[PDB]
UniProtKB/Swiss-Prot annotation, chain B:
Disorder named in the UniProt entry: Fanconi anemia, complementation group A: A disorder affecting all bone marrow elements and resulting in anemia, leukopenia and thrombopenia. It is associated with cardiac, renal and limb malformations, dermal pigmentary changes, and a predisposition to the development of malignancies. At the cellular level it is associated with hypersensitivity to DNA-damaging agents, chromosomal instability (increased chromosome breakage) and defective DNA repair.
Oligomer status and interactors: Belongs to the multisubunit FA complex composed of FANCA, FANCB, FANCC, FANCE, FANCF, FANCG, FANCL/PHF9 and FANCM. The complex is not found in FA patients. In complex with FANCF, FANCG and FANCL, but not with FANCC, nor FANCE, interacts with HES1; this interaction may be essential for the stability and nuclear localization of FA core complex proteins. The complex with FANCC and FANCG may also include EIF2AK2 and HSP70. Interacts with FAAP20/C1orf86; interaction is direct.
Organism: Homo sapiens
Top-level taxon in the UniProt lineage: Eukaryota
Post-translational modification comment from the UniProt entry: Phosphorylation is required for the formation of the nuclear complex. Not phosphorylated in cells derived from groups A, B, C, E, F, G, and H.
Function: DNA repair protein that may operate in a postreplication repair or a cell cycle checkpoint function. May be involved in interstrand DNA cross-link repair and in the maintenance of normal chromosome stability.
Entry's localization field: Nucleus; Cytoplasm
Name of the protein described by the UniProt record: Fanconi anemia group A protein
Amino acid sequence: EPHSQALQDVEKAIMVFEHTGNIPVTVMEASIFRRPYYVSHFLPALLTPRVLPKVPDSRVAFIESLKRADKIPPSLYSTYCQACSAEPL
Amino acid sequence: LVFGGRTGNEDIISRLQEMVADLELQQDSQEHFLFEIFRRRLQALTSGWS
Amino acid sequence: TGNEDIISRLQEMVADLELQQDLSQEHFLFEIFRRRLQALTSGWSVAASLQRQRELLMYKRILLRLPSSVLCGSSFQAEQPITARCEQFFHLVNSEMRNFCSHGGALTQDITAHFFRGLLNACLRSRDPSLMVDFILAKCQTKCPLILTSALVWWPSLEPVLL
């Protein structure tokens, strides 16, 4: 459940980040004050074992706007980038 | 993945443009129904705190 | 497609000029339309006829985008100041639209409804509305009868809206 719901959470997060710009605040609330849910939801934020497009898009722009806030410990970022590297008949 | 959000239509809102523009010149002390259906959508929304 | 924003900029500027005009005179748009129709090639070559047809369907599209207040005006004040910009429209419907934007000696549902809506709008906005409607639709027999012939075709369409 903390996996499947976190998908829907980051989904709406990036959606409003497109409708708005620059990091909607509701996730920023749970970030500092709810660290268990923060890390439980931050997993699907980085679980993208898929090739990157030549140009930036919503996902990666979201992640960039996150990382400039000095959050996102670089361990999970390293894991992120290496994962995206990839007779009877 | 999510990889963004499809826009789909900028045209139907341009249709609503002429719909409500016609209704404006039509009506002329009452209140507009758009805010009413707004408040209906808002009360219908989950009052939770997630 | 391209510019579903520039047409929105047109809506902006037309509503701006509408209030400014409200603050009798004819609209400049029909003069622009006249100017472009003059500056077309006068020739009878099928190239010219198709070019004129293309240009008149574009005029139809643009007029259907802007509100129906541009055609009939709004608020016919008194009986003497009546039929302002209406005669301009009727001239345009007679000279041009009957050729191309027509079928069966009748107009298209689009501009017919746009027209009749601007009419009912201005008339109810004006005083003595039933008599002024009857007046304008009597003068249409003399200045632009195609409208009535169109209202003959598109009647099961319009009557729910107008009632």
